[PDB]
Design a protein around this nucleic acid. Structure first.
Lengths: 50, 50, 112, 98
DNA sequence: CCGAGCAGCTACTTGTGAGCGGATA
DNA sequence: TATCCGCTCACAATGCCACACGCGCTGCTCGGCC
RNA sequence: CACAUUCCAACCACACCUGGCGUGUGGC
């Protein structure tokens, strides 16, 4: 009752979040200069970390 | 006993003392230190009780 | 007084950290407390020759020393922006700035 | 297999084994607490040398403020170096029999 | 500009012994 | 001022064997008397 | 004149290969 079991799904979601926080910091520092009418919501995101 | 061993009395000195306990040195003001205490235990980005 | 404190950043990201701290200063409208980046990478040393004569605006240690007024809010602002791993200075956390002699020295390095 | 070279370090540095032995050699030899020697080693404080006519103790340590406020008292004979070079000068200026 | 090598993107052990304050007579 | 007590840090925790696998991408910096 | 070596019928010399380190698993 005090020991919890985690499956592959929970670990995968955890690692997805670990990558997502890095991509979040990246998109936040990239949004510091992006203005209106200059970029589509595609270039600010990279595949690398996640 | 925990009260008579408490060095600080008000809320602001408590915050700066707990900040010094968390981070070595870096002595802020009361408002600057409170950011840590409010971001570590009561922010949904660094505390994720499922 | 706007003193010239020294700050270290991530290896290579010196100019990027400089522009990030400038955008942070322009963000919280705290220009009355800071000066400019004073990026000391004035090392136009280049290699010229056959179809390749570009310049190198690099070749300097990773130091982005910034002119600013030392304060709690100023320090917390320049530390809140990431990639600021190095805040040089012998102190607990409140260091002493550089003197005017080294100021003129780095100014001469800027002019040369 | 046997021929070796060397590196001429521009700044003489301390040997971490003799500084983190617990008890460290310099910590007992230089009759100075290991905390202050570590403070001098990582360049966050000063240690004075060749006191002589100054009011300070020759082996005493100082911070940056403790150095700037005391520099105006003596600037010619009072000197406080701040790097493994300081403890090297301490070693070289130490007598064994005395 | 070209090529070559290298950097950013933690806590259920417990026990033993030694050392460094520290507070009490 | 001596001296026991409490907090902190270094060091240790078989042995063998067998198999399998791994150190990336973008980015940054240094390389050079014919 | 002197010091110092002499570059070519079989063949001697020109050989032979990843525990750097970590992780995972299994056995005794």
């Amino acid at each position: 009752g005090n020991r919890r079991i985690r499956s592959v799904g929970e670990m995968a979601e955890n690692q997805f979040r670990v990558g997502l926080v890095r991509v979040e910091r990246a998109v936040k520092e990239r949004l510091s200069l992006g203005d209106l009418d200059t970029l589509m919501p595609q270039d600010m995101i990279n595949a690398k970390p996640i | 006993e925990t009260l008579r061993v408490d060095p600080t009395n008000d809320r602001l000195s408590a915050l700066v003392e707990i900040y010094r306990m968390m981070r070595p040195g870096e002595p802020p003001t009361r408002e600057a230190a409170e950011s840590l205490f409010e971001n570590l235990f009561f922010s949904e980005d660094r505390y994720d009780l499922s | 007084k706007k003193r010239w404190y020294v700050v270290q950043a991530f290896s290579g990201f010196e100019g990027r950290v400089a522009t990030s701290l400038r955008e942070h200063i322009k963000l919280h409208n705290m220009e009355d407390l800071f000066g400019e980046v004073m990026v000391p990478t004035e090392e136009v040393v280049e290699i010229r020759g056959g179809q390749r004569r570009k310049s190198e605006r690099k070749f300097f240690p990773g130091y982005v020393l910034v002119q600013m007024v030392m304060n709690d809010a100023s320090w917390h602002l320049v530390r809140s922006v990431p990639r600021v791993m190095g805040f040089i200075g012998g102190t607990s956390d409140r260091p002493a700035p550089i003197s005017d002699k080294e100021v003129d020295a780095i100014m001469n390095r800027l002019q040369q | 297999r046997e021929r070796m070279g060397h590196i001429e370090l521009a700044s003489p540095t301390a040997h971490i084994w003799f500084l983190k032995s617990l008890p460290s050699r310099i910590g007992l030899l230089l009759d100075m607490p290991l905390r202050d020697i570590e403070r001098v080693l990582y360049f966050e404080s000063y240690v004075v040398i060749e006191g002589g006519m100054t009011n300070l103790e020759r082996q005493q340590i100082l911070t940056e403020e403790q150095y700037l406020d005391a520099l105006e008292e003596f600037g010619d004979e009072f000197d406080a170096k701040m790097g493994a070079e300081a403890i090297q000068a301490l070693l070289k200026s130490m007598d064994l029999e005395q």
